[PDB]
């Protein structure tokens, strides 16, 4: 499936502004902005890393550098419920506790049914046997960007559109 | 050892079956307003009415918010109390009507009791037992899970469900960890290794929780106090799920949203169902909206709408204005900045200014709550300054007087200290006088 | 839930000939207004025509919102009554026309008929097969009665409902097929070798007899706005509670209009029109009125009741004054009900009904004093004095509000006119319009 | 330490004695003896830490030393005390309310002090081995850590093993592991292995191998404001909002919970409360809603001492339609004590100009300083302060090391003050665009 | 060939070593005192010692304030940062105006980084990993026309290579310092393995495999503030599609700015970085709000604030955001205490004629002597900018009739076809229906 709208882009822009070569400084400035002058770098800003590690209770001081240098959707996906130390300022406020208490709690419990309002409205209103009344008129894929005569752009577009993770 | 413009007041000062006397509970004077607030406190403790608005008005430096904090102290910390100013209602993420509705629901509490059968302790053994006839094509067909929990003054082995082994191996429970088992849900939850296993590795991450007290199996009667707004917030956003939208919302900014009437109605009906069941009970509280003349006509109209609701708390308003224009209008002159349709819906309490002796007694009480020693002649001079310029100016000058006394290494404030502090720190009238006489911008 | 301002009103108090009784169902007097509201109620319950604007105009503290609450209480269940204020339209995430469209479509209910099947029996055997990550779940359920025995096939949602409120092969359950709801009715087999994990204090019920699968027909009412929000996006059910439905496109609305018309043609669903009540309707911009003038002419429009207390006041958003704060285009297509002020007798029995609603016992002289102070001042102040005088009477340990409790409540708590006189006699102590105040007493 | 010569960088604290008596010219501050004594009283109020929520108004004419007095108070306060200096227009936000910006500025100025013990084992690993057991449920390891002087072997638990698998260690990179806390960090590869891999990569850096004792003990004191705790507990990963400012209207329930937990930690002994100053420069540029919230938020127990500066006369309060003294309503001025700043004379202007010349490394003659003092008496003080630093550049352009009278005269001719510019505008008003948008572009008719 | 747009004859202030302005130098005609004042300001910027130094240059419209600001920016060179700004640009709908003013403040403070670019490129002739399922080191042998080179590699570069699906024979690009891997394509030696193939084929590079280069990185403090305060997170080097969540501008806190200043000072103390303070030029300052004017007072007293240059063509005008504050140049008096005012004078007939001749020379136009005085008379009669903007229609009307000279008839024709503001307003007043 391809969009009928094609954005034809010259090879000069992609090979002189996005891709790194010998005559530009894409990689050098990218490293200089993301690693060398990052304020979460433990090699140069260890005091701030220790301060934030006391604040959040994260047992790794490199986690603030890893969080700030990853995409938000990727950070959503890779995140696992790691343990945090007790000696920290990031404690648990009360409704987070209740929500995390009412997980696999059964029915005829007060605190489970008090937090299952949407489930009771779903089951009471017979909402899982209702019929869909609206569909969109037109469905379209994203606009295909083509750079004629370049194979790197096809691999990059296929990696962005069909990212395996 | 921290004092800030208050906390010398401890309740109203009302004796039972009677009226308020002069100096009780940190209050001096204001007998009628204290008696009216005591009647309102009894009305809140009666736990029957809904949407009773009280407005108390007067001049500045009269003690309206002192009366509101006395109401909050007299009710106790168990009854909800939401102090608010009219400037909080103007938010940039959500409309002011939703902010007023949220602050209305924040002042209605719920007292929920629960019974929990809890197994807890250090794991002594963990043997997933096989069946007598295992089925082919699998490995370790578990018939039951035997765990051994040890605690203070007792230990007990358990025979658990076979499905708890996947929760144990998913939550990474090992031998010697302290776990937390509740009865009807399964749901293993380790808290950490015991403190008896803390000196076998030089370097390790996890904290070593102590060995838990009491028996391994116990019934604890817990009491949970949550407001209705907590239930609306916990029911608006869903439970912690396994979809990208929920974790995106958890990782992003918690933007406020317009909570629908359907969610509040469903929360109200399930709360009423569990009140009728005899488990939970309702404690209405006070929403104290201070400087109520800063509200405009739309929030006043929605206050008229929401004061007739079924689950509204009492609303306590304060305003120091007189016949003043209501904000949001250009030609509506109303008392206290409050429009007459809202004024019809509330009972007005009057607060009166003080004479010289009451100002002196308030200055003496604020000195004795700040751990300061004032001379009698210095007290008389401070009372004359307070009755000449402002009560708040004389109250705020006590700490510079104490520091100027401490500089000369004495523990008492004298008239030279108050003269030096008067010369150093000006008041509003003298500052306006030097503003008028000086033409140098 | 608690005792509110209109909690004493359950209906309009009208007979079979739509004639108002002088005191019935908590509503006293206002016979022209109550007969007109009964005409509105019968016209809504008839449901033949749509989009009629009704205006309830009168002075403050008269019984306009009381009349609307009586109409809503006489409406009964399963009819959508939307009661909004004037200030709720102004939103930072919705436009005014979109908020008015949502308020309009919250008042049109769709009564959908559903054909379900009820399965109640004793669980014999449960086989649940899941993947290693627990994603794909399937299995078989063996459930029996005293006569029959059937092996069903489970899906993901069925297994999810099974592992919640967990059934242990001998508990009698009830499964609603269309709603997907499991209610564990109790435990029947009472197994001797129970695991010592859960609090096994389940109720003992018998195994049900007869048909395992019984067909049933159920009826539920879903408003048009809920269908719009559900079909708007893939997480519309959560947006029904968070209100995060930002400016639903018109294509969804017209396709859902066509689908609702098709459901009415098929006989699956029927349309239940309701009432949209806009309290304090003068607090709306002229943009809202110009949208309302065309929203009333649609077929899917409820009977709109508006209440306002303003005289010839300035219309919001403009620079001219109009009757009731509404432009003459809206007043042309509106039907106005006029409410009138009360005399001494009606005020007295209104206070008596409010006293018996609050479980407050008044003496006759205290009721006469309350009637006199509700004639001199407004009605709402004397109504609010009742609970204060009740608390004063319970402070002196007698369960009867005497005259002196009302006198003490009058002395302690002020009305509008006394506070106005106290402000105007002491204008130096209060901050005026120019911001000038005299904090000093000397 | 990225500071150039600022507007008031010469001021290092209020020049007071031990009896709170101001010296005539010390610590960069000249004159203003009553204002400096009152600022010393306010500084002692802050340092006592037992009086909270007091509003102080520093009022005076422009170019007098109100913000100079605030800078002196901030410099005399020292480190680890939260000082938040904001302008009056900083709270008119688009993603926050004025009340939310006010309370975020309020909670940035009061903090808690946390002392913790660090048993840091910082070194380069020699080799680490992965003992993949047959069961696989538990992993044990031996960590060969080294410095430039000694090298020890450490037994390693399984949580160490899968915490070193993450942020992976490749036998020669500098790490640092706490003993009691168990924190792990990877500082980077050593300089000994710099020529081992022929190309660095993206997520790597080269650090020196640490020297001396392998196991170090250090007590580090953390000063955390309440706003930091609010932003951290407002989300799941809150430090990104702490450094990007995307907090977004934190709800009051977590603020009440944080206040209760802070009081619990203060009573328990885990931390102590360090109050500070919130300085609102140019406080007249606030709405009346912000003023009422300022009045009613000063009575909280966890409130700092608010210092306010303004230079307005009887001016209109913003958001209203009436004038007021200092641009502030009378209820706000009721709960305040006003420090007034008086105008200068010739000697104090001369001393301030001399101190500003010494702070900029500019050498002036005696008659050049007399001319600059006469200019600062006729015109304002800041005009002569700028004339010093441009006459310095004229002197270096003239191949001279000292600033003479002729350099100051040339700087006076080249750069105009307010009065000369307003006279030259009023003489040729037809050549400028006036308030009605009319202008005469053409020079001839 | 070359494009001239109301400037580009301004090559600089045209001063000597003593800071004295000649009459005609650097494309500047007249305006001696303001040019000497701007030269003093340029020397003050080049001293790199003072912070927050604010000047405002004021005068009538079309008198050369922006010309003086561009001459300052030309005299400082391209190394020193210069942020040109209009006063209307501070009003943003995404973030508040004070944050935009602070962003433009920190855009005018730059850094100089000496960095080394090292590039390995060529055809891959050997790709052998070495494990211990974890790769330990990677042996890669590149090949160019001048020879081969065999390199060890850490497993991160193999992670990038496996991202790039690099096989044997693919001409690739490797940066040594940053680890950036780019696959150019396959070589021509493997261009005949199939008759038709999806792969692209690049020739063998004629240069050496190992290339070293010294380059200069010119960044600003605002660039580091933006790169350290991405609200959603970082992004890869190659990303043709944006993130699914829209990243908007946020109010960057003072803590991030303090940490960035600390890191920059630490890099400066090692000699890696050099601090170059620059110029923030806000043009048409008179439409700044009183909020922005008030925040400018606080921002000018910062320790890292740049040299701020303001321009205004107003007289006795009300400050925007107020109702009765009448102040000179539209700038409030508490701010005007903090600047030095440089007066910009109008021109006479001879200066206008010389400016017209200079602009005609810089636009490659030959103007007759008789037409030049008529253009000067039209400049003195209507406006200088009207006479400057009429040179291009004069040139095209001359080229239409096959000529390379501006005759007086062509100037009369261009005056007849195109009208100034005065004759347009004269038509506007003496007309009935909307012009
Ligand atoms: N009757 C009283 N007895 C003791 N202290 C009082 C009394 N009335 C007022 N105060 C003190 O005066 C201070 C200011 O009063 P406040 O509540 O601000 O009055 P208002 O709200 O009318 O301005 C309070 O801190 C309170 O402690
Ligand atoms: N006829 C009535 N029956 C019952 N209660 C009434 C009646 N008339 C007035 N009331 C009481 O007086 C008040 C009427 O004011 P409201 O409901 O705001 O309507 P309106 O704004 O038209 O006066 C209500 O609180 C209601 O309890
Ligand atoms: N007492 C003083 N001692 C030293 N410098 C001063 C003093 N008063 C003012 N200054 C200097 O004068 C300059 C302008 O004064 P400033 O404090 O900005 O006035 P204002 O407080 O009215 O804004 C500042 O750079 C400040 O350093
Ligand atoms: N001394 C000068 N020499 C040459 N050209 C000049 C001179 N002064 C002004 N100009 C020209 O006149 C025009 C004035 O426009 P500009 O400087 O942008 O506006 P303003 O003068 O109102 O600030 C510029 O295009 C500039 O090229």
Residue numbers in the entry:
A (entry chain Q): 1077 to 1241
B (entry chain V): 22 to 462
C (entry chain W): 18 to 459
D (entry chain U): 16 to 460
E (entry chain T): 21 to 152, 161 to 463
Show the paper's wording.
However, amongst these remodelers, the INO80 chromatin remodeler appears largely sufficient to generate the well positioned +1 and −1 nucleosomes. S.c INO80 is a multi-subunit complex consisting of 15 subunits that are divided into three different modules. The catalytic module with the Ino80 (ATPase) RecA lobes and insert, Arp5, Ies6, Ies2, Rvb1 and Rvb2, constitutes the core unit of INO80 (C-module). INO80 slides nucleosomes with 40 bp of flanking DNA ~100-fold slower than nucleosomes with 80 bp of flanking DNA, displaying a switch like response to flanking DNA length.
INO80 complexes lacking the Arp8 module (ΔArp8) were purified from yeast strains lacking the Arp8 subunit, which results in the absence of the entire module. To test this possibility structurally, we determined the cryo-EM structure of ΔArp8 INO80 bound to S.c 0/40 nucleosomes in the presence of ADP/BeFx. The overall architecture of the C-module of ΔArp8 INO80 bound to 0/40 nucleosomes is again similar to that observed with WT INO80 bound to S.c 0/40 and 0/80. However, the density corresponding to the HSA around the Ino80 motor domain that was observed with the Arp8 module in WT INO80 is no longer detectable. This is likely because, without the Arp8 module, the HSA region is either poorly structured or highly dynamic. We interpret the absence of HSA density as indicative of an activated state, where the HSA is no longer held in an inactive conformation by the Arp8 module. Deletion of the Arp8 module resulted in only a moderate decrease (~2-fold) in sliding of S.c 0/80 nucleosomes. In contrast, this deletion resulted in a ~75-fold increase in remodeling of S.c 0/40 nucleosomes. As a result, in the absence of the Arp8 module, INO80 remodeled both 0/40 and 0/80 nucleosomes rapidly and with comparable kinetics, and the sliding activity of INO80 was not dependent on flanking DNA length.
